[PDB]
Scaffold this motif. Structure first.
Motif, PDB file in Angstrom:
ATOM      1  N   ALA C  10       0.845  -1.231  -0.025  1.00 31.46           N
ATOM      2  CA  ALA C  10      -0.088   0.027   0.066  1.00 31.46           C
ATOM      3  C   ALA C  10       1.027   1.291  -0.137  1.00 31.46           C
ATOM      4  CB  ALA C  10      -0.755  -0.004   1.203  1.00 31.46           C
ATOM      5  N   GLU C  11       0.391   2.117  -0.777  1.00 32.44           N
ATOM      6  CA  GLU C  11       1.199   3.278  -0.753  1.00 32.44           C
ATOM      7  C   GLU C  11       0.184   4.521  -0.585  1.00 32.44           C
ATOM      8  OE1 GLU C  11       1.718   1.128  -3.159  1.00 32.44           O
ATOM      9  OE2 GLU C  11       3.569   0.487  -3.067  1.00 32.44           O
ATOM     10  N   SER C  12       0.508   5.498   0.209  1.00 26.08           N
ATOM     11  CA  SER C  12      -0.527   6.779   0.184  1.00 26.08           C
ATOM     12  C   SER C  12      -0.654   7.511  -0.917  1.00 26.08           C
ATOM     13  CB  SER C  12       0.211   7.632   1.478  1.00 26.08           C
ATOM     14  OG  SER C  12      -0.747   8.510   1.600  1.00 26.08           O
ATOM     15  N   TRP C  13      -1.960   7.594  -1.200  1.00 22.52           N
ATOM     16  CA  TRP C  13      -2.164   8.716  -2.430  1.00 22.52           C
ATOM     17  C   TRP C  13      -1.777  10.015  -2.211  1.00 22.52           C
ATOM     18  CZ3 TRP C  13      -8.049   7.164  -4.072  1.00 22.52           C
ATOM     19  CH2 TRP C  13      -8.107   5.839  -4.552  1.00 22.52           C
ATOM     20  N   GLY C  14      -1.761  10.445  -0.926  1.00 24.28           N
ATOM     21  CA  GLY C  14      -1.039  11.951  -0.811  1.00 24.28           C
ATOM     22  C   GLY C  14      -2.126  12.848  -0.916  1.00 24.28           C
ATOM     23  N   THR C  15      -1.675  14.332  -1.148  1.00 25.43           N
ATOM     24  CA  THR C  15      -2.491  15.450  -1.275  1.00 25.43           C
ATOM     25  C   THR C  15      -3.113  15.462  -2.771  1.00 25.43           C
ATOM     26  OG1 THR C  15      -2.807  17.890  -0.774  1.00 25.43           O
ATOM     27  CG2 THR C  15      -0.687  16.879  -1.738  1.00 25.43           C
ATOM     28  N   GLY C  16      -2.757  14.573  -3.477  1.00 25.22           N
ATOM     29  CA  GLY C  16      -3.357  14.545  -4.804  1.00 25.22           C
ATOM     30  C   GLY C  16      -4.724  14.447  -5.396  1.00 25.22           C
ATOM     31  N   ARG C  17      -5.582  13.688  -4.316  1.00 28.10           N
ATOM     32  CA  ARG C  17      -6.913  13.341  -4.432  1.00 28.10           C
ATOM     33  C   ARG C  17      -7.663  13.750  -3.201  1.00 28.10           C
ATOM     34  NH1 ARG C  17      -4.697   9.731  -7.542  1.00 28.10           N
ATOM     35  NH2 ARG C  17      -4.447   8.082  -6.626  1.00 28.10           N
ATOM     36  N   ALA C  18      -8.799  13.917  -3.364  1.00 25.52           N
ATOM     37  CA  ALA C  18      -9.572  14.619  -2.123  1.00 25.52           C
ATOM     38  C   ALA C  18     -10.070  13.377  -1.027  1.00 25.52           C
ATOM     39  CB  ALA C  18     -10.821  15.139  -2.562  1.00 25.52           C
ATOM     40  N   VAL C  19      -8.969  12.582  -0.562  1.00 26.96           N
ATOM     41  CA  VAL C  19      -9.274  11.351   0.423  1.00 26.96           C
ATOM     42  C   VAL C  19      -8.319  11.590   1.546  1.00 26.96           C
ATOM     43  CG1 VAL C  19     -10.308   9.772  -1.191  1.00 26.96           C
ATOM     44  CG2 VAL C  19      -7.892  10.304  -0.981  1.00 26.96           C
TER      45      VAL C  19
END
Lengths: 117, 134, 260, 167
Positions: C10-19
RNA sequence: AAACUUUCAACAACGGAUCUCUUGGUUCUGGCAUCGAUGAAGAACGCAGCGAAAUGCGAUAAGUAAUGUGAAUUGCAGAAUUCCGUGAAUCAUCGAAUCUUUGAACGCACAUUGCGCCCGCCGGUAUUCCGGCGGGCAUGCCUGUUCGAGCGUCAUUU
RNA sequence: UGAGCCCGGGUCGAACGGCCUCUAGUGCAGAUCUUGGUGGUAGUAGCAAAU
RNA sequence: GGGACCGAGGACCGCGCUCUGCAAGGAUGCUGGCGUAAUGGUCACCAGCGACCCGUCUUGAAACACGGACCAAGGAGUCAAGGUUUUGCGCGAGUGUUUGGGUGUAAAACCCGCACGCGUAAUGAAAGUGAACGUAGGUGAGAGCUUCGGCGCAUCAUCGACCGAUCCUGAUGUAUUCGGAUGGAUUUGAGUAGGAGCGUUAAGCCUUGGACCCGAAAGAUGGUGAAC
RNA sequence: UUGACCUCGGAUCAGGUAGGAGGACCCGCUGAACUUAAGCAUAUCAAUAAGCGGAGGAAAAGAAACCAACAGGGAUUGCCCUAGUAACGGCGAGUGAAGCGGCAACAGCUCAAAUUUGAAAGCUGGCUUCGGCCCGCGUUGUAAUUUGGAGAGGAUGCUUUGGGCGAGGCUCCUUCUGAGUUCCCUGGAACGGGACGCCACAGAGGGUGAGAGCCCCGUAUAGUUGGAAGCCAAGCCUGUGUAAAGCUCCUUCGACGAGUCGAGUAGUUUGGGAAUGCUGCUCAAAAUGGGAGGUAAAUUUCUUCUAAAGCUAAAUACCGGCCAGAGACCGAUAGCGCACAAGUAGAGUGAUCGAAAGAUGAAAAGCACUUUGAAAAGAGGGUUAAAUAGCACGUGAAAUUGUUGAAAGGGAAGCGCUUGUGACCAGACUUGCGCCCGGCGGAUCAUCCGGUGUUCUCACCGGUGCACUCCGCCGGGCUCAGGCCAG
């Protein structure tokens, strides 16, 4: 002093009673094999080398050739009756030689030897 | 209580073995007690049952019903006895399921092997009885 | 398990998407895909501070304290009300120590469980054995699932001498429910004070007493403690002639009248 | 793990192993120690009952009560005090107690078969011819060449003749 | 006043929370040492009356032999299969066999049920033709056997 | 006072509680928290991939 | 004289007085009503008055801003090793059984032979040396006891005494190049000057470990693939 | 011409061997970075992670070119302690042993260096009637003897033997070994409650229609049947050869490992420039030798061991294999990703990523039949203790929705204090003692009799009575006391 992975190199001691009972069973098995014989061989009285422990004495590795000859026990026959023999050690003192001779004589006086077959 | 290390008191393993035992073990489990006259005639308490035993019921809703064993369904741990049947919706009679532990043997289907089994069990019994007595 | 919770990619989606910025599993062809991982707040993740085997389980207790507490437990067993205090139904036995004859408790005379039961009934342990038998009960909880299904009360503790009484009563009372058997040379505090409560009912024997003397003098490095109080009776200490003579006049009564 | 789960799923019998140990935990045989050994008791207690010493080494811990199992010179040398150039080397010349100990003592002190070694037929014949020719002169028999190819010493010949029986 | 919206009660929907259960998982401890060219781990294809899944098995294919137990299988079809018996079983044990194609993979090729060479057999007009079958044919190394080469080298007129 | 506790009525079917201690993976409204379920938007936008 | 609110305590004791008992350290006496319902509870509504939506974050303060569609379950200062303060407990100038051995009703309980850990004398860089002149000193307080005459805990201030070390002073004597005796110093010690420590429990704090939970870009190792 | 010896090759010749797998533990090679030092570069991380090669049940190490300065110790290995000491260090971060001592276990050996030289006495293969016949290896060295706290050779005089069967025993699997289904109630069912019993070296566990020591499997101790393989072994037969072996003594000998030590040098590593160890390059040894230490003690005095060949069980590790037993653990969003089709379904070209998902009922007894009607659907009717337990099935919350009923609604709701109205629900002190008469019956009543247990002076029974005393029950009679709220 936790710079390294003590998490991967920590080893516990939950098997202490198990190892104790295993050691007891092992010495019992040795006794069953050598049923009339003692479990451990006779060992000489030696002195601790360092100055901090000179006045104390302990058990050695094996008896000296001169001590065996003085006690009258052949070198080749002593291990068969259960006397540890150390060829490296030297007496260097009449006191230690006499002490080990007395110990071997006591062993002879307390030993009973069976006649082969 | 239990002393031999081979025996286990784990309910998990006990239930697994009981529910996955092979057919011979299922027979041994579905042994059943013998009646009185049988017990004083053979000096045996219980033996495994077969398809030719006249049996009497001592527990359940059909208590005191007598008949001959029709079958021994080992997969469901149950025995089918004659004349103990229920009617389905269509009316067909399915034999009602009853347990060897809830039935008691009244007559034995005797052959060579059965006589040998009773002889072995009995002989052990008087052997140990004499050993205790004298 | 050490790998439990983080045996997952698993890798963090980061601040790219609204999650929420939480490590989310990769892939796009499974219901698992896109779900949170590695978190104690996330389902199927690792727990906070996972339990490790190197926790302190065994506690080091000084031998002096252990011997002191065993002596205190023996004194508590000698004290009669403490048996009721601990719950032992002690009403028919003619003596609270209850020393029984080594002649009748030695050899094979008590090897049979029937003989042991008759001896217990004669000496007065019958009520306690019946109490444990009728208190046979089901445990509430998951101990039933984990192999501890039933709980019952505790019976009397039989104490003997292996040198003179032998080891047949061990099995004879081993079979009887509730009652336990313990040698005089290896008295167990867990049996002397069950659950931390003092006043265990113990059926003694004469050899056991004569050997309590010997072992308690034989223990090296330990002496029977000298107590800080000689006369335990505080009623004696207070309501005594010397104290009552030396006291001054009272300044009031137990219940004071209201002035205004 | 997958291997264990495959054993779970397969309809193959579980191969239970018996509790087999390399070394027997108790002695066995028609000997005194085996006959008098008590299985339930431990090594130390059994040796206490037998009357023998189990461990010759120093006691490593507290023992059971009463077990007894664990244990003018002009030339100034203590060895003269300690005394009672060849020694017997295949045996040692040795000079209210437990039944096992007395049984072992009787077994040790029992007489044993001699099993006397004897001589070969050709050795007997050779000695016979040598005696026939040279009588009883050890020097002459050592001196001879033809009848005595292996140039054994006269003392050797004398002891062989004594063992054979004829002078 | 109805409709609509809000609150509550009864009842009925949705949903799977709480209590309960566990042929599961995790940890610890004890006994023992056991894969493979005599074909391993693994992959594939087939074998059942009805077989989807799982398991077992390998053209002797939910399997055979032998031993032990002692009257079953079981969801349905079924036996004139077997009951004072060398004898049922989706039984247990297990020392004996069968063991398809691949795979360290081994005649060459491999993505073809293709193409080769030596030894023998079989059937169909058959000493000639065809097709099939059995035994075989990898490499490096060790020992032995045999063969060969080298003016390297020894001689050989008694 | 309070976190909470006891009882009455219905349902329900196999275990459970009070006290003294011991232990801890022990108390939630938030974390654009995790999972699951369900609404308004809405029978609306639009017939568009999927279905 | 009229009106309003309350009756707190529960044998006597006390202060008193107008003394056959009284309005004196706190309500009694009489009469009536109360079970097809006295008195209550929840829900809904109306009615008077009051009343910003919570948490976070910033600011002197607000104001912004962040999160909140709802409900159920999960959800975050934990565990080790090493230090330290305090409470309790055991022993005590000693203390700690549990590395191990013996034993056992067998991971329990009981037992201990030799070591070891810390402490019970210090100082000097070092060679090394090495803690009493005085009831281990006095004076004054000081809790406490007291035959009231006086004894005096712990501790403090001052004047003392001694030891290690430093700068001297330089004895009998000395192998003739060795010595420290005696008397000193506005000296120094983490010193002596009639020991308090070891183990254990509970709580608190510190360091490192993932370190209360969540959340970078990056770097390296080994593989998979194609391409401007 | 011929035949050797040596070397190099072929054979689908005969006999074997090496792959791969597994890799938890083990032996080597190779080898990072993040981080810390609140920046960072030496250092740390770490002689780790990844990668490569190689075994076993353990591996490795191992019988001193050791420790030590001793009044000596004495193969290796693991624990405690030594110890956070020594020592090293951008002397910061930090790094960091070892001797000794207490233990566990303990076992020692094989070679090269010699001439069997009065006898290659040694070994491989194929051919067998399995007993002994060849072929080849090999003297450029196979047997016996010997390995430096030794030994050899003689003399010397003592003392030891070797093989083959083998009863029987131990280990392990297995056969068999105790006691209620007695009576009543509740229930669908008794394993529940009550009464009366029994067993127990067996009251662990599980099944059976609900909590079963005595219904059943098992459970405990001693036995007992049959069988497998290893080891041990009482005993019984053969030895035989001037064969081997241990010693004592001495006018006789005593071989001990080379591009290896060592010097210079680069790299790597360690606490360790006497370079800590190792590797690479150049040079290159000795035989009163060499190594490592002690020491100012007066010159390298003294101490202790033999390196460059090899074997070896036990104490030790073990996320792996065949099992076994347990837990103050988790209890279907938990516990391994997987209690069930789980590395399955599915995604991606690929390396790889990887779920969701348990419970009807005791027993299917899984709804016969009639009747609607195109359906995963109803109305009757039936099974069950129960079907609002109907394969959407143990119980069945909240969010959200529908029907019925009540109330309210003029541009927010919701909340607080205080009444009122309506609706529904509850139900206040649990409501008695005392005295006086007449009758009846029991009793610490009777200086009553008898029995039993006892704290030996207190109790409890059996038997007579009602003269006195005390209790009740009945039928009269009188009194008092009471819960709340108002005036």
């Amino acid at each position: 002093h936790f710079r390294k992975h003590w998490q991967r190199r920590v080893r516990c001691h939950f098997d202490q009673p198990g190892k104790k009972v295993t050691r007891r069973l092992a010495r019992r098995a040795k006794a069953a094999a050598l049923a009339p014989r003692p479990v451990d061989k006779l060992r000489p009285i030696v002195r601790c080398p360092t100055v901090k422990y000179n006045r104390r004495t302990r058990l050695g590795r094996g008896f000296t050739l001169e001590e065996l000859k003085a006690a009258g026990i052949p070198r080749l026959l002593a291990p068969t009756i259960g006397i540890a023999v150390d060829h490296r050690r030297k007496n260097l003192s009449e006191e230690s030689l006499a002490a080990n001779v007395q110990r071997l004589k006591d062993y002879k006086a307390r030993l009973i030897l069976f006649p082969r077959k | 209580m239990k002393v031999r290390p081979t025996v286990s008191s784990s309910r998990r393993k006990a239930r697994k073995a009981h529910f996955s035992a092979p057919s011979s073990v299922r027979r041994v489990i579905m042994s059943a007690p013998l009646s009185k006259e049988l017990r004083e005639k053979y000096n045996v308490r219980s033996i495994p049952i077969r398809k030719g035993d006249e049996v009497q019921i001592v527990r359940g809703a059909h208590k005191d019903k007598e008949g001959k064993v029709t079958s021994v369904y080992r997969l469901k741990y149950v025995i089918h006895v004659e004349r103990v049947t229920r009617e389905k919706a269509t009316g067909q009679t399915v034999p009602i399921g009853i347990h060897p532990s809830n039935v008691v043997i009244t007559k034995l289907h005797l052959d060579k092997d059965r006589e040998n089994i009773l002889a072995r069990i009995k002989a052990g019994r008087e052997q140990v009885a004499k050993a205790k007595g004298k | 398990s050490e790998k439990a919770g983080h045996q997952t990619s698993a890798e963090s989606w980061g601040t790219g998407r609204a999650v929420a910025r939480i490590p989310r599993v990769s892939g796009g062809g499974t219901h698992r895909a896109g779900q949170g991982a590695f978190g104690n707040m996330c389902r199927s993740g690792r727990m906070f501070a996972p339990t490790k085997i190197w926790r302190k389980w065994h506690v080091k207790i000084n031998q002096g304290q252990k011997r002191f507490a065993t002596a205190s437990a023996l004194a508590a067993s000698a004290v009669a009300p403490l048996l009721m205090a601990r719950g032992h139904q002690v009403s028919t036995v003619p003596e609270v120590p209850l020393v029984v004859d080594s002649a009748a408790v030695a050899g094979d005379a008590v090897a049979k469980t029937a003989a042991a039961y008759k001896l217990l009934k004669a000496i007065g342990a019958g009520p306690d054995v019946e109490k444990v038998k009728k208190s046979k009960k089901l445990r509430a909880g998951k101990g039933k699932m984990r192999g501890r299904r039933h709980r019952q009360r505790r019976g009397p503790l039989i104490v003997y001498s292996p040198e003179h009484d032998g080891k047949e009563l061990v099995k004879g009372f081993r079979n009887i429910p509730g009652v336990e058997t313990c040698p005089v040379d290896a008295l167990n505090l867990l049996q002397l004070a069950p659950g931390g409560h003092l006043g265990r009912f113990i059926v003694w024997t004469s050899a056991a007493i004569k050997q309590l003397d010997a072992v308690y003098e034989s223990k090296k490095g330990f002496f029977l403690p000298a107590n800080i109080v000689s006369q335990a009776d505080l009623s004696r200490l207070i309501n005594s002639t010397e104290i009552q003579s030396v006291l001054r006049a009272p300044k009031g009564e137990a219940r004071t009248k209201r002035a205004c | 793990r997958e291997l264990q789960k495959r054993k779970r799923r397969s309809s193959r019998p579980t191969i239970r192993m018996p509790n087999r140990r390399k070394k027997a935990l108790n002695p066995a045989g028609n000997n005194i120690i085996a006959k008098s050994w008590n299985k339930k008791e431990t090594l130390s207690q059994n040796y206490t009952r037998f009357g023998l010493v189990a461990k010759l080494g120093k006691a490593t811990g507290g023992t059971a009560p009463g077990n007894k199992a664990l244990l003018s010179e002009s030339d100034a040398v203590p060895q003269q005090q300690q005394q009672e150039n060849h020694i017997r080397q295949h045996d040692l010349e040795l000079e209210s107690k437990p039944e096992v100990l007395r049984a072992l003592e009787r077994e040790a002190t029992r007489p044993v078969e001699k099993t006397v070694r004897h001589q070969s037929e050709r050795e007997r014949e050779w000695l016979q011819r040598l005696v026939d020719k040279h009588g009883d002169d050890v020097a002459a028999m050592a001196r001879d060449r033809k009848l005595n190819p292996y140039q054994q010493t006269a003392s050797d010949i004398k002891r062989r003749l004594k063992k054979a029986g004829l002078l």
